[model samples]
Target: TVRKAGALAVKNFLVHKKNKKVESATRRKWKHYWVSLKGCTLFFYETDSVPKHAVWVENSIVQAVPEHPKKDFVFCLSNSLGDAFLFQTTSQTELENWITAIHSACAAAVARHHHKEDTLRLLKSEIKKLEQKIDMDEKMKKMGEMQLSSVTDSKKKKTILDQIFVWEQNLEQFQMDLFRFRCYLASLQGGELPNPKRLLAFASRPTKVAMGRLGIFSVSSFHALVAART
Candidate 1:
């Protein structure tokens, strides 16, 4: 019965249309497919040798093609060797060609999706950092002004307040820039992008309480206005 089944397989292979140039054609096709389906597990072993490893469960399977004069290419399958009988391909060559094509397509799709998710994450992170820095700078500037007022006389206090007012005007411009950047980052669709949790946490903090302790109502009021604008 085994000899009869083997003879039937040989007869089927002898009549396959692709069999004439199957070796060279399969090699070229598999190389391209291998590149595309990089994540799939691959196996290499001689046809006469028993395969101890199952590459299929790792995701997919690929078999290695032998150099000239070798009788059979390695049998690559998405199933274990024990289940090879279930596949439609009568010969190892046909099976390997089919697996290579399928695996390549799958790998390419996975890789593209990964690249997109990464890009979105990066944009979000950059905006968050800028927002944090803006908040810190405003706080430090207010602290400096309060320290100056303790040593300066009434006339000097008026002069210092005038300069601080100009700084307040510049803060409005900075707020507008931050708003625009945040919008731009949110617009992206995919890729390894920055995590927005940190930025969101920083932005949601109560600027009112923080600024109230410093006796800087203007800075706190401005932050409230900026938040409202967004």
Candidate 2:
């Protein structure tokens, strides 16, 4: 059985009870009702020209009390069940605020993670292109040297060799610049921050693959040229 004991007018207005077995179900219904109420309520108090008094009830419950006097009153009236009454009356706003904040923070974190991943992907593509360019430059340099060696005319041989030397120097400088850029990107903090061992391993895999392909292509192309010459 439930009973009310308080200032007679206030108790009559605010206090009520259901049977003990139905209490939990009633509380759940109350929570659902409040959620729907909040959903329909807009934050616009002034622009809508709604009377200030109209939204007062929604904001009134924001204050925190050091102790709930109503609970004490209910407990005394209901034979020591006032604690349960106090818990029922507690506002749901704080819980909702915390849930909203956490959701926003997690969404922001995921967005930043994806942005960094895209930047790394673009850098990886550029590095691969540069590797291909380097391979092509080396092949051209080798062809120039071979031409220089086979020439019977001394003036033409000297010119060809001079051109080969210049090309070699340009290729060397470009390769050095590519290496420095690769190192700079590999040093960046990503995913779980920069792990030196993992960075080294990640940086090496594509480079080794590129070099292996160059070796195979050079061997095959040289053999084909030799067969043609024969």
Candidate 3:
């Protein structure tokens, strides 16, 4: 459809499919096609009526084919569909334009994929910190309880109770966040792409408990992210 639609980049170039089968060294074949890029799709055409060959570049890797063993201005688009298109530019700048255009189209998906991994790493470290804090608070609460029972002075007893209360509250908050982090981690590991920003917001908050109360945890954010991909 991009052949008739407005394309982001369009030009004529010498193109060919790289075959795995052995061929004569001097008989390498190529075709001159008007190629157009729209979104992450590439359309190759000899005329405007229809595409001769089409490529989906979203999961495709764009790289320069070795010039020593190949042409100097040649680049390749290799995709998950096991399709590889080799294109040769009339000039180096044209090759760069097509290469960068495809790269730019696929850049957002790559960035979002990395965001999931990066957030998971940060979440695991934060959970470890919370676990250590929970352990320390439990130990301190034990000591505080003993001190509260042994102290004779009323003021001293109240002070120990206050310290124990603070520690208990801190421990509770830590456990809640740790629970949330683990839940989020499981969701990500289960192949759901939730919004990493929401997790970041929860991690930075002093009161991560409010998020649950506000009903901010939902799979709708994943849908939003999916909608954004288009």
Candidate 4:
């Protein structure tokens, strides 16, 4: 239904099925038909008559008939119906013209089909990105408020928001974020709320916990590091 108006322009001679396999075998009469390309379909009429064949040329899958040779400027034109049309030309010039025209039509049909497929591919990718973004936002929306209420090191909490702002951005960032918050519950439980800006500052900057002292029993200085981190 969807189409390029003038894919098949005129009549061309074809090997009635028998002629395709044995090119050297001579035939008294050649099958002829009017041809036209419709999207991936190639429609043919009994030469100078009614519709005879429609080819669904998909993805440039058509190949030339090398074994048969181009004695008639011959090539294979496969339609979707599993039919291959091997046509003969009136002249060497006509043969080339028809071959070029048919091949180009096939190529254009394939391109348009794939072009549509490519557009679908792009939209699919865009949807995936949006879904990921929505997933992130929803997690932060409900989980963030609850987690904030759960922590207490009021001053220790100050910088956590700074960390929270950027928390869900990276892979595993959320897990590490909960780790930082959990550290505060044990260290500074039962306290006042920290100021948003000050809390913001501590979380904004980075600090390294001395590795040797880090894996120690005290865990007290780590508390201080977390507090002044920003």
Candidate 5:
């Protein structure tokens, strides 16, 4: 049973297709399609429920293919196991958003750390401890609500009530953090990274990655603006 992942609620975005290429195809094809995101795993179809396809959702790397003359909106995605995919969009912001999202997601998914088996186990243990502490805060905060109401002095009550409110907010935030943490914990159990919870948003690096088509030696280029293509 192939459960379609990501955005079941939002209508798939319909965007103009700019360029698509095959293994070593000398020519590029342009077409229309629908696109959706699931963290690092992007899903696309040929129809708007559109063009038909899905991006590789695995240990892969991303390369911002250098643009030519006016052939903007193109970037490359490649799997570590081998094979690549190139895509294009009508707007620079759309393209930029796609790559920015992909760039971070793919980079993190490929680099999920590899001390393996036990080495990284320590970090998970640490994460678990932290999760417990945060969870504990929620419990204690709830039980202490009665204590706050018992503060009969007006001035003291104001301070205690304020503290209680802040703790409540923090409890919610702690749960959010714990939600993302659980995702990382599940990675070893079979889930993937740059996950839907966006745990790697801060770890995003800005360096450009270049991978030439088929077999050319690509030259270095400056980082292009996010407003480049459309």
Candidate 6:
């Protein structure tokens, strides 16, 4: 399956006719339809109730076709992959409005796409550092155990045990943090776009929290790690 920018839940509607270049002589050159913009997607319908077609405007280029001698405020939207759609508007304002809205939607989708990539990159880097720290903690624990085995006196042995206990607690703490970040990474990579757990929302929750201290404390640190990068 082809992966494309996922749609944001947004809507703007307009009515227009689509122009077809190649058709039977008897067939209508321009077919009437209702079009609506939803995120970076354009939904076409024969009637407002049911959507007949959806098009992603993310990777597409939109421009006015001034070459049309008849004019009538025509514009073309086309993608890098070679498919093009010619649309006709009723007036100059209508044409300009459609162009501006589609351009803005495309810009937003592209921004979202880039932000997703940036978030994933930062997450992986943090995960790598966390794993390295965990490994270092394991080595320290092993060294502490080796030292304990060599110590014969109970007084010194007890001191060594205390130190090892501290290391053990730290190791466990790091492990918990590692797990939280890994779960977050999995959520980020699971879907295409517009993840149910929004990247920004998930990473920005700590900023929105009030005095709820240790309750959501664990995830907040991770959120800061991500939000700081932004």
For residues 139-205, could you state the per-residue lDDT of candidate 2 as single tens digits? 8878877777777898998787676666655554444334323432442322211232332232223
Give the runs in model 1 whose Cα sits over 4 Å from its true position. Answer: 1-122, 148-152, 189-230
| Candidate 6 residue-wise lDDT, 165-227, digit = tens | 666656644644454345435434552112223322322233334213312222222222222
Over 106-133, each residue of candidate 4 has an lDDT whose tens digit, in order, gives 4454435446444324334433554465
Q: Put down candidate 1 lDDT per residue, 67-169, tens digits, no spaces.
A: 2133444332222111111123336545444444443333333334456444335435545776676677667557658865686577777776665655554
Q: Per-residue CA lDDT of candidate 5, range 48-125, in tens?
A: 245256555443333344453356655554433234455665565554555455544543443455433452264365
Ten-residue stretch with the least lDDT total in model 2: 75-84
Q: What lDDT, from 0 to 1, does candidate 5 have? A: 0.42
Number of backbone-clashing residue pairs for each candidate, in the order shown? 15, 1, 0, 8, 9, 0
**Candidate 6, lDDT over the whole model:** 0.49
Candidate 3 ranges beyond 4 A from true positions: 1-28, 66-71, 109-230
TM-score of each: 0.27, 0.31, 0.37, 0.32, 0.37, 0.38
The C-alpha stretches of model 2 lying farther than 4 A from their native spots are 1-117, 189-230
Compared to the true structure, candidate 4 yields what TM-score? 0.32
What clash pairs does model 4 have? 8-35, 8-36, 8-37, 42-55, 56-80, 158-199, 159-199, 202-230
Least well predicted 10-residue stretch by lDDT in candidate 3: 221-230
The order by descending TM-score is 6, 5, 3, 4, 2, 1
The candidate scoring highest on TM-score is 6
| Alpha carbon lDDT of each predicted model | 0.34, 0.31, 0.49, 0.38, 0.42, 0.49
Error of 1 at 203 (Å): 14
lDDT of 6 at 109: 58
**In model 6, which range of ten residues has the least summed lDDT?**
8-17
TM-score (C-alpha, index-matched) for candidate 3: 0.37
* Residue pairs with backbone overlap in model 2: 75-82
